[PDB]
Each structure stands twice: as C-alpha cells, then as structure tokens.
Design a binder for this molecule. Structure first.
Ligand SMILES: Nc1ncnc2c1ncn2[C@@H]1O[C@H](COP(=O)(O)OP(=O)(O)O)[C@@H](O)[C@H]1O
Ligand SMILES: Nc1ncnc2c1ncn2[C@@H]1O[C@H](COP(=O)(O)OP(=O)(O)O)[C@@H](O)[C@H]1O
Ligand SMILES: O[C@@H]1[C@@H](O)[C@H](O)OC[C@H]1O
Ligand SMILES: [Mg+2]
Lengths: 297, 296
C-alpha cells in the first residue's frame, strides 16, 4: 500500500484529501492559508503539513500540491525546498494548474480562480499561460480580497455621510466586529494586512446583495466583469471557447451570474466543473507514482 | 509678555515657531516626526518638546499643536496626557486644523490635503469636520499612494498584454528599479504593506502624464476627481465656495488642473496653501488665549 495526498493550498484555507493508489478515499483534512505571502513561510508550510497529516492520518508517501502564491522564480525557490520535506515524494504546481487539471485531467483548457485572490490560467498542451494572479496589491481583480476592500471603502464613505447607508453597512461591520468609525480606525491599525480577513468580508457583500442591496450587487458586478474580461482574453489567446470557474467567489450566485453573463456575451461557455482542485493535485501525484487515474475518476 | 509656540507634528518631521501675544517673533526649531504611529509615543513627545524647547528656547507659556496620528479616540487618550504637560497651556488639534487655520486665520473654511494620504478638513465656526483621511486601505482617494497603486496595477495589465504599453510602463518600472515581471512581483510582496514606497510611484505617473501619456493623465484625473468631490461635499456643508489645496499631489500641474477643473465646474473656487502649518498653530493658540491674529 501507499498513501497519496492531494493538497490545494490557498489564501484562506488549505484543503487536502488522501487516497490509495487504487482510487480509494482514505481521508480529508483542512488548515489555514498556504499562501506564504499571506501568512509567512513557517505558517504556510505548517498549515500544509497539518492538512496533509490530518487527511492521511499519519505519514503520507506522496503529496501533490497546488499552491497559491507561487508567482515568481523567487517564490518557487523559497517554497519548494521546505515543502519538499513533508513527504518522501512531493510534486508542486501553481494552484491554477491543479484546479484546471482536476477537470481537464491534463488536457488543454482555461480555468478562472476567484478565491482569496484570483487568476486566469490555461494550458496549450505544451505550456502554461496566466494573466493576473500576482498578489492582492498588483492584481486579484474580482477576488474576495478585491471585493472586501471595495466594501470597506464604501462603508467608510457611508460613515462620512458621503453616501446613504445600505444593508451592506451593518453586514460588513458585524463581520469584522466594528460598531463605529472609531473602532474601524483601530481595526485598520491591526487588521489592514490580514489578507484572509479582508477577503472574508466578501461573504458579507454577498449576503447584502441577496437581501436586495444594489450597492453590494454593483461591487460584485464590477469585480466579476473585470476578472471575466481577463478570462475572455486568455480564452481567445489559447483558442478555446470554454472556461472552468473555480473558487469561493463563485459561491455568490450574483457574482456567478454577472460573470457568466459577461462570458456569454463574448461567446464563451462557462462550467463550474465537476471536481475540486485537491482532486487535481491527486491526479498529478498519481501520474508521478504510476497510479491509474481511471480508478480515481 | 507671553511665549506662544505653534507646532506642526507630522509623520515625517516637526516644526515649531514662537511669538509673544503682540505678534512679535521669538524664534523657531525643528525635530523628528511627531506622529507617534511612525516612531512610538515616547519619541514623538520628546521631539515635540525638542522643537518647542528651542523655538522659544526655554519655557513656553502657551503651545498650540497640530498633530498627525490622532485619527481615533484611542490615539487621543494615548497622546494627550503627556502632550498636555509640555506647557502650562496646551491646545491640541489634528495637523489638518492648523493647515486650515494658517490660511483662514481661524475663520470657517475647508482645506484639502493630498500627500501620501489624503483628507478634507473643515471648520464651521463652532466645530471641526472631516471626510476621508482614514488610511491607505480604507481611504485616501486621490493621494500619492492611491495613484501609485493604480499605476502598479495598470503596469501589470500591460505586462500581461491586456492593454498596450505606454510611456507610463517604463517610468514606473524605472522608479521602483524593476525590470522583470519576476522582479515586479517580488517588489510588491516586499513593499506591499508599506505605503511610502507605493506613494513614490505617483511621481512617475506625473512624469508620464507631462510627456503626453493620456493613460497616466487619466489616473491623475480619477484620483483628483474622487477627492475633489469630497471637497465639494464639505464646502457645501460648511457653506463656503472656496477651498485651499495643500500636499505633494498638488505639485503635479496636471493633478492640480483636473482638481481645479472639477471644482470650478461645481461652482467652487480654490487656492493653493500660502502659509505654513506651524503658523496656523500659532493662530490656533492666539484664538484660544485672546491674542490678536492681525498683529500676527
Ligand atoms: N457566498 C459567498 N459569496 C462571496 N464570497 C464568498 C462566499 N463564500 C465564500 N466566499 C469568499 O471566498 C473566499 C474563500 O475562497 P477559497 O476559494 O477557498 O479561497 P482560497 O483558495 O484562497 O483559500 C473567502 O475569502 C470568502 O469571503
Ligand atoms: N509632482 C508630483 N506629482 C505626483 N506626485 C508627487 C509630486 N510631487 C510629490 N508627489 C508625491 O506626493 C508625496 C509627498 O506629499 P507630502 O505633501 O510631502 O506628504 P507627506 O508629508 O505625507 O510626506 C510623495 O508620495 C510623492 O511621490
Ligand atoms: O498565485 C496567485 C496569487 O498570487 C493570488 O493572490 O491568488 C491566486 C493565486 O493563483
Ligand atoms: Mg484556491
């Protein structure tokens, strides 16, 4: 026997699933962020190692992982060595790769990730191409963090009396446990660089949007179209008329709607896909150790 | 005979000037930052006492100070105690107040301060008002940080090939001494959560704009207009048709123009700051202790 573990290490959570080499599910586990840009190398590795240990219920023989944050030769150099310590055999890819291959099983295609951050990544069958996916300051259009920041800035303007307060106002304050501008200021001193925390506010935006807040809908719409525009670009670029949609942001029905309406308008078909990204990581591990992908899917 | 000192305690540095109650100059001194957020309460206080100490070299009777960093009640509770003991009589206000009074002479008015951050301060004769000025993440529309971020994001888009490269591209990359996408990425992750580095990019945007880059011009325009509209809101709430403009952002001719173009369209006139903040602090003190601002 042998224990194969697939891990999807993101900006909010790290998800791992463990299997046999015979397509038999053994377990699952989850932990905090695996994006070292968000929590530091020690925490990221520790979280990944924890999710793996949990899902495998001990030691794993092989671990395949898709990692958010591997956005430069630099990142790969800093992360690869340490991540390679978690199991005798470890395969490392960008998180966009495992998300796509979970669906295309390795074939050409384009996937859009809208989670804590965002990215549009595709495979030509020869090379991987990506647009965006370079961190919260430089990119991550339409990501949960993007949405969260937009929401926070709007609440402040409502607080300043520059705009009418809407449902969003209370939803957001509650989520971050703030009651007034004074607590918001203090909150900013301590929480401004907590990426997953800012991104968590996206849920509040969705809540408001579902309860009729047009201001929240507007935020979701702008973010969704900004990211979708990039998906259309890479789709034409690669030559495919279909893209897969993955990530926590797509849990927002409104976000998803605006995203697909924009894609449809551009002649692009969207698919939420069938499998989770960690399954794509297991697929990669299987290929690495010779286990048959057929028993898996 | 009284010794009145006005103090401008900014995040970068502190300046204090002394005068008697009859408007006669006594001296001045400078010192390190006054924003305890940038250098810890202990350091800020000692510096403030530094400038004040020399400005009037020795004891001071009254001290009016504009301080950067008191953006919340917590900040006030932290700073005020020690600050109020620097002189027998000490008046404390936001650095925006003295900047405003330096121009209005203590009368009602509105002033826009657009530098690394941005804010609109106003006084209606009875109480001080404010909009924005709440930090890089939540606020600071139209600040150097704000335009710097917009530029960075646009430069990545150009690299990804989502938009045509314009002169702005090279200007931002040269300013942050980056030549690679790999290099850009690592730069952002090192300078991510520290505002000064991002705000410095605003200079490259201005330079691009001056060289005809309409894409750069547009960033300045959207920033200036987002802030300008807050200025309009406060001007109308206070009841004045004019506002004063101060800050490094107004060193950009184009930003200034877009700002004025938008103000005028809204029936509001404006003028650049024509007096130091520390003088506005002396004015704040004068107003509090009954000294004639005209003699000043
Ligand atoms: N219904 C929803 N509407 C909007 N945002 C949501 C919703 N559900 C979850 N999210 C957001 O999506 C994020 C989680 O997405 P996820 O894909 O797991 O990210 P990552 O891969 O970076 O860990 C959180 O930041 C959360 O705020
Ligand atoms: N001509 C200009 N165009 C664009 N930005 C400028 C220009 N001159 C200065 N700046 C920017 O404005 C800031 C300086 O503002 P300043 O008023 O000195 O504020 P602070 O006291 O907070 O440093 C810097 O971030 C700088 O990049
Ligand atoms: O690597 C990408 C990261 O930079 C972004 O923040 O989130 C999405 C990831 O794919
Ligand atoms: Mg993810």
């Amino acid at each position: 026997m042998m224990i194969i573990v697939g891990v999807d290490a993101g900006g909010t959570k790290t998800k791992a699933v463990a299997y046999d080499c015979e397509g038999n599910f053994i377990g699952e586990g989850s932990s905090g962020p695996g994006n070292y840009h968000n929590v530091g190398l020690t925490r990221a590795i520790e979280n990944i190692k924890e999710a793996v240990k949990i899902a495998a219920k001990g030691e794993a023989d092989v671990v395949g992982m898709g990692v958010a944050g591997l956005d430069s030769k630099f990142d790969w150099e800093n992360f690869t060595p340490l991540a390679s310590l978690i199991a005798p055999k470890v395969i490392i890819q960008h998180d966009g790769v495992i998300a796509l291959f979970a669906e295309t099983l390795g074939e050409p295609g384009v996937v859009v990730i809208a989670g804590t951050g965002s990215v549009v990544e595709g495979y030509n069958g020869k090379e991987f191409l990506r647009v965006g996916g370079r961190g919260w300051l430089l990119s991550d259009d339409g990501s949960a963090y993007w949405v969260g920041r937009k929401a926070l800035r709007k609440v402040l303007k409502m607080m300043d009396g520059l705009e009418n307060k809407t449902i969003l106002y209370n939803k957001v304050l509650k989520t971050i446990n703030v009651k007034d501008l004074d607590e918001l200021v203090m909150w900013s001193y301590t929480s401004s660089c907590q990426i997953d925390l800012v991104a968590s506010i996206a849920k509040a935006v969705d809540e408001a949007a579902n309860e009729g807040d047009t201001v929240a809908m507007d935020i979701l719409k702008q973010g969704a179209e900004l990211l979708a525009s990039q998906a259309v670009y890479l789709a034409r670029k690669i030559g495919t008329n279909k893209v897969y949609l993955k990530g926590g942001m797509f849990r927002s029905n409104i976000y998803h709607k605006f995203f697909t309406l924009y894609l449809e308008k551009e002649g692009i078909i969207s698919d939420l896909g069938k499998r989770s990204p960690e399954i794509g990581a297991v697929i990669l591990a299987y290929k690495e150790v010779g286990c048959d992908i057929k028993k898996l899917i």
